[PDB]
């Protein structure tokens, strides 16, 4: 194109590179904080899950009510975080809907409610916004657990789908089951558990719910901070690579226009 077009395009892409470098650095800082804060939350979550891990509970196959919770965030440019989470959500949703189970969906984050807006439009029971803006505390998990308990849906089985943070580059979408005291009480593996009324058990179930939601929130925050870091890194690298060719085009077009101008000037002088 003309030199003006190359000038404008190079300006815009230089601006893009600057902003993406900024986002990469800010996301790296946020990820560093989140990873520091996730070390104890991992121990906490594993402790919460221990009972269900080694006191084998399975919900009997004749319970209609299922729940799907999908953990994600609001801010975009996170990569395939929201995509993978929602894809797994809907895969499991359809799988369960084959067996004639009245599935419900809860999304923790705007991206999940948006993505699953077309399909599963009515199955939503509640979703939550203002996620990821700041690290998710335990108060956030307690709010989600409360708003689940109060909502007029006594689920029988549930699953929560989030992004287990493996490393800075690799995270794996994971699902974790969650049970209901209607199922806890009538599990044969729970007979050995002494001093268990049908009341301390509902308190314990509510606390376990808050626990697992908090754990999934912390994993999700770490995973997406890393994912945004890497996505911004790739974007900035590609922007710099584009600048590499665009500056050459700038220089060549400037030289060509200079030569043409000089040639036309000398032609005019020769003609007169």
């Amino acid at each position: 194109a003309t030199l003006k077009d190359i000038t404008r395009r190079l300006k815009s892409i230089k601006n893009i590179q600057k902003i993406t470098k900024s986002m990469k650095m800010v996301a790296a800082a946020k990820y560093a904080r989140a990873e520091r804060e996730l070390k104890p939350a991992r121990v906490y979550g594993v402790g919460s899950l221990a009972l269900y891990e080694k006191a084998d509970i399975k919900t009997p196959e004749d319970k209609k009510k299922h729940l799907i919770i999908g953990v994600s965030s609001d801010r975009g440019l996170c990569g395939a975080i929201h995509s993978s989470v929602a894809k797994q959500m809907k895969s499991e949703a359809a799988n369960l809907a084959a067996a004639g189970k009245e599935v419900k969906i809860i999304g923790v984050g705007d991206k999940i409610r948006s993505i699953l807006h077309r399909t599963h439009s009515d199955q939503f029971l509640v979703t939550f916004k203002e996620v990821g803006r700041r690290p998710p505390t335990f108060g956030d998990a307690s709010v989600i657990a409360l708003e689940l308990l109060n909502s007029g849906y006594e689920f029988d089985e549930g699953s929560i789908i989030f992004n287990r943070f493996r490393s800075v580059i690799s995270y794996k979408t994971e699902e974790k089951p969650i049970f209901s005291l209607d199922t806890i009480s009538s599990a044969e593996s729970m007979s050995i558990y002494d001093d268990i009324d049908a009341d301390v058990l509902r308190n314990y179930q509510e606390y376990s719910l808050a626990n697992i939601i908090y754990y999934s929130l912390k994993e999700s925050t770490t995973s997406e901070q890393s994912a945004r870091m890497t996505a911004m890194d790739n974007a900035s690298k590609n922007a710099s690579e584009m600048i590499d060719k665009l500056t050459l085009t700038f220089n060549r077009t400037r030289q060509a226009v200079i030569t043409k101008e000089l040639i036309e000037i000398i032609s005019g002088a020769a003609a007169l």
Binding site: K39, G47, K54, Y193, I196
Partner: protein, 133 residues
């Protein structure tokens, strides 16, 4: 016959599959001690102070506000408190002021939910005062 003790607030951690000898906890049904082969149980805590004795005879006391305790078949105890602080991390004067404040608001039975909330606050502050004193 050894115990695998895990104990963590959401924010911090205190014991991570350690090897302690006894753990005394409050549990919304009593206040009991867990040892190397206690019978399996599940319980939820009340505001109290969990005392842990390590293999050597040293006692560490942590005030927990709420949570759960799981004693398992393999003698692996998991004690998850929503807020645990060592007793040196608490103001006696502030706690007593809060207790008297809550007792003063107890008169205002705004409703069953608010009556219950104020009574829970009074109970928690009572446990705080009794532990600090």
């Amino acid at each position: 016959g050894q115990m695998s003790f895990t104990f963590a607030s959401p924010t911090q951690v205190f014991f991570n599959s350690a090897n302690v000898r006894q753990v005394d906890v409050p549990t919304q049904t009593g206040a009991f001690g867990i040892l190397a082969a206690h019978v399996p149980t599940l319980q939820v805590l009340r505001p109290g102070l969990v005392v842990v004795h390590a293999e050597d005879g040293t006692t560490s006391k942590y005030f927990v506000s709420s949570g759960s305790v799981t004693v398992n078949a393999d003698s692996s105890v998991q004690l998850l408190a929503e807020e645990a602080v060592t007793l040196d991390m608490l103001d006696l004067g502030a706690a007593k002021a809060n207790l008297e404040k809550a007792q003063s608001e107890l008169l205002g039975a705004a409703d069953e939910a608010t009556r219950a909330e104020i009574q829970i606050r009074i109970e928690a502050n009572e446990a705080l005062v009794k532990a600090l004193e």
